[PDB]
Enzyme design. Structure first.
Site, PDB file in Angstrom:
ATOM      1  N   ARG A 127      46.363 -66.567   3.570  1.00 32.45           N
ATOM      2  CA  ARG A 127      47.076 -67.209   2.476  1.00 32.45           C
ATOM      3  C   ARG A 127      46.092 -67.561   1.377  1.00 32.45           C
ATOM      4  NH1 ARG A 127      50.327 -69.481   7.018  1.00 32.45           N
ATOM      5  NH2 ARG A 127      52.471 -69.212   6.292  1.00 32.45           N
ATOM      6  N   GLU A 164      45.925 -80.899  31.292  1.00 29.39           N
ATOM      7  CA  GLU A 164      46.337 -82.130  31.999  1.00 29.39           C
ATOM      8  C   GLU A 164      47.657 -81.959  32.758  1.00 29.39           C
ATOM      9  OE1 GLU A 164      45.579 -85.592  29.550  1.00 29.39           O
ATOM     10  OE2 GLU A 164      43.472 -84.987  29.207  1.00 29.39           O
ATOM     11  N   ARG A 218      56.796 -62.520   5.755  1.00 35.19           N
ATOM     12  CA  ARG A 218      55.741 -62.586   4.763  1.00 35.19           C
ATOM     13  C   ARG A 218      55.826 -61.341   3.870  1.00 35.19           C
ATOM     14  NH1 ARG A 218      50.701 -65.029   6.246  1.00 35.19           N
ATOM     15  NH2 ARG A 218      49.971 -64.528   4.178  1.00 35.19           N
ATOM     16  N   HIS A 233      44.678 -88.121  28.517  1.00 37.77           N
ATOM     17  CA  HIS A 233      45.264 -88.153  27.172  1.00 37.77           C
ATOM     18  C   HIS A 233      46.788 -88.304  27.216  1.00 37.77           C
ATOM     19  CE1 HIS A 233      41.480 -85.855  26.315  1.00 37.77           C
ATOM     20  NE2 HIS A 233      41.540 -86.441  25.068  1.00 37.77           N
TER      21      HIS A 233
END
Ligand SMILES: [K+]
Ligand SMILES: [K+]
Ligand SMILES: [K+]
Lengths: 250, 250, 250, 250, 250, 250
Positions: C165, C77, C220, C5
């Protein structure tokens, strides 16, 4: 007999490869009545089997009893006798306000709230219906002008707490199932019944084709005095649909 | 922008309510090229969006990235933008010896081997495709003469140990996934990929329609040297199928 | 290319054995810019790889994309190409009132709310960082006078429901995640992000060293209009820290 | 009818508070024949009920069907009718080589391999028999000179893969259940059947008394041609035992 | 010594095959005091072992320490030294309003809220007591006129949150255990203790006989100032019962 | 006493806020002897507490007993008494062939093979050590020239089947734990012991600092006759390390 429970020997079946599998013998007799040459083959415990013919091909109709365990024996033994396609019809309480009594539901896949499905595949595997069977059932419903909904069904090993009923001896529901109904509603589940997760999973995991259709007799989201006459018509409609779908699958 | 990641306003969509969601931008551009008046709207991180017209209706094509997590952000943010139908096209390795390179798979439902699907529905809920979308993909496949299989797909959060690959830095696979491939093979699972259990579950559980088609570029059960031109042609065939199915869902 | 990839051949890497792995290519370029001789190596899907040099040793920087699945391909990888140490930097929303915007968080171990970690080790295994990496990151933070918190992070496969959320298309959260945020706060979890449980688990279970640092861009627990300028400074600070830690690990 | 499935009014029961619950109607009639003034009350689907008198007290005998789901409807609806004590009698295949055909098993508690028990209590709760009922069954067994074993039973939602049977249409068993039989053997489990984990758990958790006895008709560990007369005699012996135990619980 | 922890060599045991296993050495000494020729054998960590004689047969008494892990070492090493029957006595807080302080509880099976039981059998297996042991304990209780309850006990690896106590350093309970107490009460669980699920499961899964009795020192459902004198009498009563049951098992 | 089990008042602690928590009293006394003005405060069941002074500050040393359950009572009750920092020292069997007897392990986080950790945080939460405490133990180890490994430890509720030992009364290991040792070996796990998953999780989740060091007394991967003097010396070395680390955390 060639199998352990159903009392059926394979030549009894005359080469059939499709079975309709409703829950109880009364309905077996109703479904056989829409085809040619209906003959009762056997009756042993909850399994009553008839044979009939549809466009010249033999079809078997065999009751499953209530719940995945007896359903799993029936499907297994019919498969041992060469059945490869299974169609279930039943009746059901819907849990969505847009579904009305007398509508028909075609189940694409089921929420696995049963025990037997796990004996065929781990929970991550989908209890999904076969695409051809589902197609034949949707087409059959349209052939008699049924109001149809296509979607997910929740498949419970219990009639009472697993469907979040409180009108019981204990009047309570164990914590894992308390509030479950409203989760399934939010996620768009159409209805509860008791055999499809076992039926669909064991067929989809073993190279058998299955589909599942049901007539709505109750809508859980709105109180309403059941009308016995609407129920009987709904049943008769759902039986014609299952037969007509079988016709398209033979 | 009207959303947090996609860099898209609703205005950009010109009323579109169907998205084709491939994995990568190169495929985004390839899909859009098949349609009329394609224009690039935005590109941020793994999300690249084009708009195009199909039979005179706007359609969005937007890349998901690899895996359920970025898929889940794309789908949620397109939904926020008014998308209600999602079609995924992928390319995949089959795990059944009857499935050949160049065949097309249409996924009825997926084995949930991912994490993000659980953030939408517990594991007992089926990762199942919308019936209309699966119908359109099967019809579109037939319309170009594709050799098609319709069935269950295993959807893994990893390309390597979750697909039971050993050609890795560790060369081993944790106990839970060792032997898994053969189990899925026995249970008729067609193929592995990495986003469908997320896409299907989060759509099925939130009243969004989704379907999924893939072209087969490898058959894990048969050693064979990959043919770079066969793969390009198979990608072409899958892209045409997904555009044709979208035509039928507009 | 030597891998499937990332499009990288091993001599490209010049003997490097450490990679910094942020989420997106923009930040790859920022991190490369703090070292010598930055050169872009490859860009394929969400994976953009640069090489640079730090005190005379080659270092790789490679984007992971959002979520454990693409993170798992990149780490796998790079490991196939000989990388043995991995350091992630990101940005994060904190969920504790004592942590301020612009503080830096060093993650000792993560709550596994992802799917990919399970493909490396069963859930009981800790998604723990390597002690040397964690040390280098804490020391690096102190070398530029950062306000630092060292502790547990919750690592979710979703940005939306898994981080609890509600400002979403459905505006609801599935039962298993509803109320989860307040449990993690009570248990002292610092923040949410989306890749660390996969990163730390797959490295700790396979003899690779990993560490994880993040700058706080949002808190938050207290409403507050984001300040884009604080965010950019915080990012720049967290990038210097990751580079400086790499310096101490080479 | 006072209940939804059983077709029974409370009036029908004439104040009965003990039910013997075998699986099938043929056994219902056989049990009732042992007692005084037996009369058939109702038969709908797999549920057939007779009433009879034992030492001058009314007792109900009502068939469960195969499996936890139909068991769970019978037990709940009898409870609704005022039954507070339930005794199951079955016939079974033993899995231990010291247990012979014709021996009697009394089950102290069951391995929960079913789904319906979970709808009453999480899996950590024991599927355990009431002490008085187990005492009465052990005493009743001794009173006819039966060779008895008292111990754990495995209770499966399937007759075939959950009992690790390979003589099936698939001839295979899913990974979770492959090898399971030998594990249960090592742990001293006497036998398999299909309803006790449901019955015992739902009774133990709702203040209903339950016990379970079975006659051994097969020994899975020893090949031997079934003797149709030995089985009838063993069924007779088990039925007498269950009636005698009921005598002691009235 | 013949074993790793208890410091016991087998001839020390004089052929004994029954052990009484309370939690702490103080009670070991009390139990030894009700038999002939008590002699202290060993004391190492939480394991204190005495030997005594009962109707001329040798009996061992050995403390387990608090919790299934140390309980599992003691039972395992006594079994290695030839013990085949184990009886536990302890003291307990009841959680049912009908159970009074000074009553005695005989445990038929336990809710597995421990970790060690899983090292012997998967959670579906019942943590059930042996029928003979349970019988001897119920008979022994009746031989001194004790008020006895026979039933299920919840067996927790913690004294504090697992028994849903809030009078702690954190004053909170993790979500899985919050509200657990009221579920166990509804399901008729008698009391909490900390060792029985490990004791019963490891014996029932390995061909050893175990039983479990306890005196009630506290009733969680009703505030009440503990009376130290009632507690001491209750303890003395429960010790006599365990000894008297051993007498019936030898 | 100010607590339920420990027999300690807060007054006894003279303001101490750090405890060293070994398993057994003999080790309690050995640790305290290294420090100034050590005095025994209390001994009840497996909990023996001494107080001592280190650089002029009071420090508590208190034995946990074997296993998470008694550990969890000690930690909770010391926390109630104002302890906020906990350091465990143990001796252990390594499972990696590069680790030799006499080496020191410092545990960054533990594989949760226990039950009590779940009573504090679900299994996805890491059983991770506090960074300051791990830093101090690593520094203390280096300061005496110990050969040290820093890494993951598996923490089991059993000494025997959970550590995959077969030299037992059963000589077998349940399916879940059969093969487990090799898996943990592959994943780099250093060693087994029985209390760290409890200690670390309950501290990490309740804002208490904890660390853990152990001396290697066995290497399970290499047959070798135990040397009783090597073990004593290794215990000495570990005790010195834990006292030195406490010096750095006061
Ligand atoms: K049934
Ligand atoms: K991605
Ligand atoms: K202990």
């Amino acid at each position: 007999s060639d199998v352990f429970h159903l009392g059926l020997t394979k030549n009894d079946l005359q080469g059939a490869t499709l079975a309709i599998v409703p829950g109880g013998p009364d309905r077996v007799e109703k479904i056989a009545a829409l085809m040619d040459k209906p003959v009762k083959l056997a009756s042993h415990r909850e399994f009553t089997t008839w044979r009939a013919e549809l466009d010249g091909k033999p079809v078997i109709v065999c009751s499953t009893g209530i719940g995945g365990p007896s359903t799993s024996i029936a499907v297994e033994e019919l498969a041992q006798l060469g059945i490869r396609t299974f169609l279930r019809i039943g009746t059901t309480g819907a849990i969505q306000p847009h579904i009305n009594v007398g509508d028909v539901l075609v189940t694409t896949a089921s929420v696995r709230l049963d025990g037997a499905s796990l004996h065929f595949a781990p929970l991550e595997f989908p209890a999904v219906a076969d695409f051809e069977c589902t197609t034949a059932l949707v087409e059959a419903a349209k052939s008699i002008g049924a109001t149809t909904h296509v979607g997910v069904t929740a498949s419970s090993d219990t009639f009472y707490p697993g469907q979040e009923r409180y009108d019981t001896y204990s009047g309570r529901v164990v914590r894992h199932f308390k509030g479950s109904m409203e989760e399934w509603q939010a996620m768009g589940v159409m209805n509860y019944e008791m055999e499809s997760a076992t039926l669909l999973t064991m067929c989809a995991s073993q190279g058998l084709r299955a589909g599942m259709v049901a007539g709505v007799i109750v809508n859980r989201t709105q109180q309403e005095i059941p009308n016995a006459e609407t129920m009987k018509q709904t049943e008769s409609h759902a039986v014609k649909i299952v037969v007509e779908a079988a016709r398209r699958l033979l």
